[PDB]
Amino acid sequence: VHKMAKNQFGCFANVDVKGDCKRHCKAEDKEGICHGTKCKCGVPISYL
């Protein structure tokens, strides 16, 4: 599957969109950030 809305959890323009980058990072117990047309993790969900 192509690296345009099928690999970045459909996220773009730094927005949490369609596939929600949040969820793929929640598997890792992390926040998910859209960094352009790209999805990475932010920080641990352990906010304390």
Curated annotation (Swiss-Prot):
Q: Which cysteines are joined by disulfide bonds?
A: C11-C34, C21-C39, C25-C41
Q: Which residues form the BetaSPN-type CS-alpha/beta domain?
A: 8-47
Q: Explain the purpose of this protein.
A: Blocks Kv1.1/KCNA1 (IC(50)=185 nM) potassium channels. Shows a weak hemolytic activity.
Additional facts recorded: Negative results: does not block Kv1.2/KCNA2 and Kv1.3/KCNA3.
The identity of this protein, by name, is Hge36
Q: Which residues of the whole protein are included? A: 48 to 95 of 95
